């Protein structure tokens, strides 16, 4: 028993010169490192055409449809007065009906297929209000239904909706909703069949906020379909059988080696009947291995539906893919680890490991409470406090000196209005950058440190 | 006395042991973290709500009565000839009169009431110049009686002050004074009852400067009231009693082991005769436990009142419940120094503390001199330190490498005017920078080493 | 030969004290040094004032040729209706034919001379679109031949172009091209004879993506050429050979010894007997002054060249020269490593940085897997994500303390959309910031202290 | 001798149990920081308030005089046609005649009184034109005489000028020169009197590129004058007084010490025979009160001169006086340095310094040639590389992890330009970032944690 069990903790070199066996995992490994690479890279290249048709569209469509839009205004975009907002609905449902003589791009109107749209018709503008709205603040007085009415005039593509009506002091919202069909002919450079997008946009006046700013917003979403009739004067399906071959493999040959592990561990446990020192079994790295083959695998299925059109789920694919690839780039510091030289950091690394995360628990409890303080305190008055995600950020930010002095300008530009916030804000500031840098990076530091002097010794 | 001694300072478990004493302390403690946090959640989100309705209210006004306006302009807005003035105030006198037909908001006039408001009065346009304001700069001569005097024109809501005629030699400022009512709806979505707001709405062109640049703004006060006769088709009040009630539990328990430690410190002093060992007795953490329930008590009874509407003191209470947050979070580390990986940690840090804080105190002469020196020399000339507090924030954000580069280039656009302050900005720079990076955050990791070094021995 | 070995390895002063030769090569670096300084900052400060002269012609071009064209504007500048693009190629062509009158500066026009412009042609105004284009988005269909059919219009300097008819739906691009000649007066100050310029001017007009906006650009290219007939009412050349020479006077010493290190390394093998080792014979120093000088050498032909108009190639001779600059001043440290305290600190980097370099490497796995991942994800969504390199410079500054808010708020910006990305982001970046700031920096850290430790014993 | 001797390096505790000597001294010196930082505060809140002034006058200057001018434009303001040119001169000398009657500042014109304005003249409009300027880029050809003639209208203040005839092909510039009178009334608040001002207005037309763009500019000299009868219905000389006489005491006081430390030096020398040593009876403390005291003394006589209006060195007080802050707070550290514990730290910085000097020789070889080599290669390209002392800023703040993706991206937007300097600067940025940020500070760190471990043993 204790040859086998030295044999089976016996580096690769070592098991080649004891059993001269083959190995063939790590050339497995080797090729799916490159294979996986290879084939993210392509599905990167692919996709990024597509975000970028779909980008240029929907900055197409703001030019097009938005009265007086201006690149880089999306986030002040607004009306003011009920000219403007008239002004702007009517402009939008006029360069609807002119988008056939006036646009550079190639557009098909579609008309009825659901809601809001009736049959026959291709653009919806529903005005949303209450159904009981009665407002007197001179005499500080409301009778309010909160029941939504939704009421939508049907615009049929090439003038009743000259005639609409806003109910200001009700109204919820305006939504003019429309959709467009084109086709992708930039997918002929890259050698790709062109394919057909539905682009449905929806444009919003947003008057949830009742404070006489009412903003403007312009989204679209793209349907992708495979052109019917397609008409233009095989190497990514295969390769995604070979990555699929190359990962099915590579979790075939790792779970043998956990199989192998986990009977040799019972057979050393029976022997000295005859966790912690259990679980020495277990080789984490090909727990690794495993997870990406799945990982893999699962992305690559998913790729597979998604380039034949049945799929759209590019986010989870993505993921898969990315989460896979990284898993299998880090999975290469195994092989370093063989070498003394290299092991020496690593080890280092992970002798380290367990007191960071102690003292990033410790260090936890600090940073939550400066995270409520501000933003509490600071929410109303600092555009970078207003939700606790943002703070944290904000607060992440400054622990590593970025972005310091935009911060306290921000406050400096409201001292005269609140003395007592600005003091507060000052002694927060302060003192939360000065602890987090001078002591607890130089803690972590020192923790690092200590490790590699171990390590050396 | 020995034994009791030695009972005083057991850790939790080992009273437990002892005593079997059921830690009643400790559980509150959490209660009171886990509630704590809750209701400080809970009161941030009721707030943003009211702090986004104010600023909307206030852009809006600004793009309704400042002629001209655009969004980023607040800081350089202004007027440059008497023509632009007139129109601007007039603009905003018109919009007024007109707020009703043109608006997107609803908005009540408010008539009368005080000052500068005459009976039947809604807008108060007022002009302040000097008693008597002779100026001749041709024979560089003047008489000025400083004493300022003020000449209203009062305009009821729906045109004498079409007649205003400013005298620009003596001007002191203009400004438009008025008030407007309306109802938040906003309130509906998160389950409120809309309440009724009063905007004061102040705008101000200002001469204090008589620099032949006027500047324009818009600034607004907000008075909340619940509306009378409400109109809609009790978990705050009870939570808040929950918390109370958890604080002073807290506080009372807390004081009893505060006087307990005192009694037993008076017996072993008297015990010994038959300062700093003394407060060996005092348990910081339990000081810290009550001010942290006087802070929430105050808090709660504030935020109790200002949901009633009996109260306007939102920074106030902000602050301490905020403060009462971060010290229940930061008491946190008492559990964590009961176990030894953590506590090495967290006793490296209490045995650096004291040289750190010595360093400081080496280190601020020489952050002061440089203050006031760059304060003093590039203070004409760059943006970032026309004030000692913006000096003290730049020079800060430098020692943590944020904003160095535009720091350096705004002395570099002014080179060649003065060569003299463009190398004194120069060397003044370099040296600061170099110093406080290379050898006092140095030193400041250095000391956390030996800290750390030292605690593993 | 232990004598002659040991006088090898003697530091000038202990070779000065022994066979008492001047130090010949010591004072030839030296004055290397100063003269290719010297050499380097004429050549730059000649070249900055061309650059200054292209860039402001071609702001004036653009100024000048683009239709509502703004400074800053040049990513963003686009067409979006076919009235602006006919305005905008009408505009370009009326300006190029008004030229003269209109103008500040003095241009001539440059007739035929190849291609795309015809003999006696100014102007060519080129469409390029596809051979057969039938696009039917209703229908779902297309009917494309790929290949590109160029029709060009040619005006002559001082209207059929006015009828220029543009096939929208089968468009790939615009173009417009012309020449300008002018004269570049600016070179009187610095004391230099004026030079002629040419500018090819380009405006393009591209719609490759067919989204429905077509960016609008213009570039320019400058040909130099002496001036024919000059007319205004040597310290240039002097230099270049004077560096020549003295680089090639440094190259046969650093040969010569060299040669007699390689003879004495070959004469100690000879004797030992009757590849580490042996390179200690290599002085790398002197390598390094080889390169330095044939670098120089090569870039002070070329400069030669092309301050005389025969040659073009700005760049690699800028290379060039820079790198042997670098390399010459590198090489002063070769003099610090004979006075004990400074070799002290050199030798401390020296033998850091095997470690460093191993710990590198095992870092760039990790550094590998992220930019893949986050290309992959993050690339549709986030701007500075889009390409590999832009990923690894993102990361680098992240690392780095730089740009970190930023990049969170860009994200932040899109959480309500998927909230599962915005999810995967704040991990992606949160471990990636924290792994490479807290712990790999660290080891960094730890690397330089051990290696200055083990050198002070 | 001995006593003497040991007395004359004793503290001044041990002084003062020894003899009982009051430490008049240094109650002095804490008197003296005082009342320097006092002065110090006065005489910048004193400044800015001018300078306030001047800025606010040369806006409302350039936005009155300057055709089509929007703040934030200064540096990117030029023309581009000849009748954009015409236009903003014309309306520059039209707002000169017309500012009585539209500017909101009030101001008084100022006729003759040298060159180049003749008598009974408020405006000059120059041209700076060539003597010969036949230039031909058709042929090629061109014949200058670079001599400069110079030619001016005179404009009275209440149409000649509007007959002015550009010479574009031989232009090098056009300024436009005036004087407004001013009183500045702003002085009344802070108990001031007011004082005329004399505003000397610049604007330039340059056209010394030539190349089809003028750069368009307006400038503002402030000469500060008592205005003579002034009307409005001392504690700022006596305090200067109070500062120079403390500075006097003070310099007199440490002149003896030092006169008392060079005899005991002479003694001990003449007693040991019967530099590095003799230098130590050498108090640099005093040495360095002493230069405080003198630039004290002499900003103060400097700032009494200016505040009566005979000086107007503003700059050169300003440094003086700051300069002196500096050293007066930071010789507060020799009162810590006769405590143990701030002692440690003091002498732990005091004996890092010299090898961090040395390791700063080191470094700052291999600095300059970066600095040379991105200069002359990024320089073209590059806007942060366009000047040597740009590129020492751009790369200290790289070092210290500021701008670093702002720098990588402006190169990125021309990678597709020349792939080979992409490429070039690719490995520039990324070799000197990593150099010096995780090998350089990391030797600075190491130096002086090695510095502070000696100190603790
Ligand atoms: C076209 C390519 C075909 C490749 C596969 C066929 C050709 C080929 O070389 O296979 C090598 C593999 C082993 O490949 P591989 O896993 O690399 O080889 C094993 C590992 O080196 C293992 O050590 P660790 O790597 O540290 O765990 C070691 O203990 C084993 O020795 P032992 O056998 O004496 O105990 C080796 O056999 O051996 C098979 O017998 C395949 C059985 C697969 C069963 C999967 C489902 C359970
Ligand atoms: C106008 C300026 C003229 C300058 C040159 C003439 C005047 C002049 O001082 O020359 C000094 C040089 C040597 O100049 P230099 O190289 O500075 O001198 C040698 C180096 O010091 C070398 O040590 P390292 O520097 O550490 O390698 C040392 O071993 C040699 O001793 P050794 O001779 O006893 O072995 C020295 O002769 O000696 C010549 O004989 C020139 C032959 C050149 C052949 C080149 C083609 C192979
Ligand atoms: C209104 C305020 C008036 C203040 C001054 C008068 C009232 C007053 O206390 O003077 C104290 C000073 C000394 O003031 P101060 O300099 O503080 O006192 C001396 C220092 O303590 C010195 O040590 P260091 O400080 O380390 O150098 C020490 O060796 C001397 O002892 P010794 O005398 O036994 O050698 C002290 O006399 O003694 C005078 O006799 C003034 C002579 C000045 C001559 C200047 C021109 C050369
Ligand atoms: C001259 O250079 C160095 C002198 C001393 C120490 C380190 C370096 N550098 C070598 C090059 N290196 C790569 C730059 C391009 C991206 C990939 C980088 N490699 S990396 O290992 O992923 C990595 C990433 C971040 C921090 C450290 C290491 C940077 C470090
Ligand atoms: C050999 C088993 C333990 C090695 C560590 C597990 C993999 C580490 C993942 C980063
Ligand atoms: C146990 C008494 C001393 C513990 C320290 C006091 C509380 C620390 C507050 C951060
Ligand atoms: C003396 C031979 C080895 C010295 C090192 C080689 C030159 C270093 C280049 C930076
Ligand atoms: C006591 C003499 C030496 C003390 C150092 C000199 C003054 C330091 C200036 C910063
Ligand atoms: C020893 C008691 C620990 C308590 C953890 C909250």
Same mark, same amino acid.
């Given at each position: 028993?204790?040859?086998?069990?030295?044999?089976?903790?016996?580096?690769?070199?070592?098991?080649?010169?004891?059993?001269?066996?083959?190995?063939?995992?790590?050339?497995?490994?080797?090729?799916?490192?490159?294979?996986?690479?290879?084939?993210?890279?392509?599905?990167?290249?692919?996709?990024?055409?597509?975000?970028?048709?779909?980008?240029? &569209?929907?900055?197409?469509?703001?030019?097009?449809?938005?009265?007086?839009?201006?690149?880089?205004? !999306?986030?002040?975009?607004?009306?003011?007065?009920?000219?403007?907002?008239?002004?702007?609905?009517?402009?939008?449902? !006029?360069?609807?009906?002119?988008?056939?003589?006036?646009?550079?791009?190639?557009?098909?109107?579609?008309?009825?297929?659901?809601?809001?749209?009736?049959?026959?018709?291709?653009?919806?503008?529903?005005?949303?209000?209450?159904?009981?709205?009665?407002?007197?603040?001179?005499?500080?007085?409301?009778?309010?239904?909160?029941?939504?009415?939704?009421?939508?005039?049907?615009? !049929?593509?090439?003038?009743?909706?000259?005639?609409?009506?806003?109910?200001?002091?009700?109204?919820?919202?305006? =939504?003019?909703? /429309?959709?467009?069909? =084109?086709?992708?002919?930039?997918?002929?450079?890259?050698?790709?069949?062109?394919?057909?997008?539905?682009?449905?946009?929806?444009?919003?006046? !947003?008057?949830?906020?009742?404070?006489?700013?009412?903003?403007?917003?312009?989204?679209?979403?793209?349907?992708?379909?495979?052109?019917?009739?397609?008409?233009?004067?095989?190497?990514?399906?295969?390769?995604?059988?070979?990555?699929?071959?190359?990962?099915?493999?590579? $979790?075939?040959?790792?779970?043998?080696?956990?199989?192998?592990?986990?009977?040799?561990? &019972?057979?050393?446990?029976?022997?000295?009947?005859?966790?912690?020192?259990?679980?020495?079994?277990?080789?984490?790295?090909?727990?690794?291995?495993?997870?990406?083959?799945?990982?893999?695998?699962?992305?690559?299925?998913?790729?597979?539906?998604?380039?034949?059109?049945?799929?759209?789920?590019?986010? @989870?694919?993505?993921?898969?893919?990315?989460?896979? =690839?990284?898993?299998?780039?880090?999975?290469?510091?195994?092989?370093?680890?063989?070498?003394?030289?290299?092991?020496?950091?690593?080890?280092?690394?992970?002798?380290?490991?367990?007191?960071?995360?102690?003292?990033?628990?410790?260090?936890?409890?600090?940073?939550?409470?400066?995270?409520?303080?501000?933003?509490?305190?600071?929410?109303?008055?600092?555009?970078? $406090?207003?939700?606790?995600?943002?703070?944290?950020?904000?607060?992440?930010?400054?622990? &590593?000196?970025?972005?310091?002095? @935009?911060?306290?300008?921000?406050?400096?530009?409201?001292?005269?209005?609140?003395?007592? @916030?600005?003091? /507060?804000?000052?002694?927060?500031?302060?003192?939360?950058?000065?602890? $987090?840098?001078?002591?607890?990076?130089?803690?972590?530091?020192?923790?690092?440190?200590?490790?590699?002097?171990?390590?050396?010794?």
């Amino acid at each position: 028993l204790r040859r086998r069990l030295k044999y089976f903790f016996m580096s690769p070199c070592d098991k080649f010169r004891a059993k001269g066996r083959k190995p063939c995992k790590l050339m497995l490994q080797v090729v799916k490192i490159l294979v996986v690479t290879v084939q993210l890279i392509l599905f990167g290249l692919s996709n990024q055409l597509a975000v970028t048709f779909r980008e240029e &569209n929907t900055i197409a469509f703001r030019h097009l449809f938005l009265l007086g839009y201006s690149d880089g205004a !999306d986030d002040t975009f607004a009306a003011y007065t009920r000219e403007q907002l008239y002004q702007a609905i009517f402009h939008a449902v !006029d360069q609807y009906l002119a988008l056939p003589d006036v646009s550079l791009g190639r557009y098909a109107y579609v008309r009825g297929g659901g809601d809001p749209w009736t049959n026959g018709s291709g653009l919806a503008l529903c005005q949303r209000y209450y159904h009981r709205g009665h407002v007197d603040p001179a005499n500080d007085t409301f009778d309010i239904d909160p029941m939504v009415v939704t009421d939508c005039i049907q615009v !049929d593509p090439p003038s009743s909706y000259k005639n609409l009506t806003l109910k200001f002091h009700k109204l919820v919202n305006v =939504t003019i909703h /429309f959709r467009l069909k =084109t086709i992708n002919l930039q997918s002929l450079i890259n050698n790709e069949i062109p394919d057909c997008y539905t682009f449905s946009v929806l444009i919003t006046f !947003d008057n949830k906020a009742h404070s006489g700013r009412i903003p403007i917003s312009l989204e679209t979403q793209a349907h992708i379909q495979e052109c019917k009739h397609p008409s233009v004067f095989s190497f990514r399906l295969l390769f995604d059988v070979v990555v699929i071959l190359t990962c099915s493999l590579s $979790f075939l040959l790792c779970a043998r080696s956990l199989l192998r592990g986990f009977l040799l561990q &019972n057979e050393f446990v029976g022997f000295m009947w005859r966790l912690w020192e259990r679980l020495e079994f277990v080789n984490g790295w090909y727990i690794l291995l495993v997870t990406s083959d799945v990982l893999t695998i699962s992305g690559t299925i998913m790729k597979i539906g998604i380039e034949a059109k049945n799929l759209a789920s590019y986010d @989870v694919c993505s993921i898969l893919l990315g989460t896979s =690839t990284l898993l299998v780039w880090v999975g290469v510091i195994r092989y370093l680890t063989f070498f003394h030289n290299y092991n020496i950091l690593i080890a280092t690394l992970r002798v380290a490991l367990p007191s960071v995360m102690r003292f990033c628990c410790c260090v936890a409890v600090i940073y939550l409470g400066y995270c409520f303080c501000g933003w509490i305190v600071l929410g109303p008055y600092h555009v970078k $406090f207003r939700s606790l995600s943002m703070v944290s950020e904000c607060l992440f930010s400054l622990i &590593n000196g970025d972005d310091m002095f @935009v911060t306290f300008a921000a406050m400096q530009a409201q001292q005269g209005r609140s003395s007592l @916030v600005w003091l /507060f804000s000052q002694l927060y500031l302060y003192s939360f950058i000065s602890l $987090f840098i001078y002591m607890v990076l130089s803690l972590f530091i020192a923790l690092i440190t200590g490790a590699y002097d171990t390590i050396k010794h």
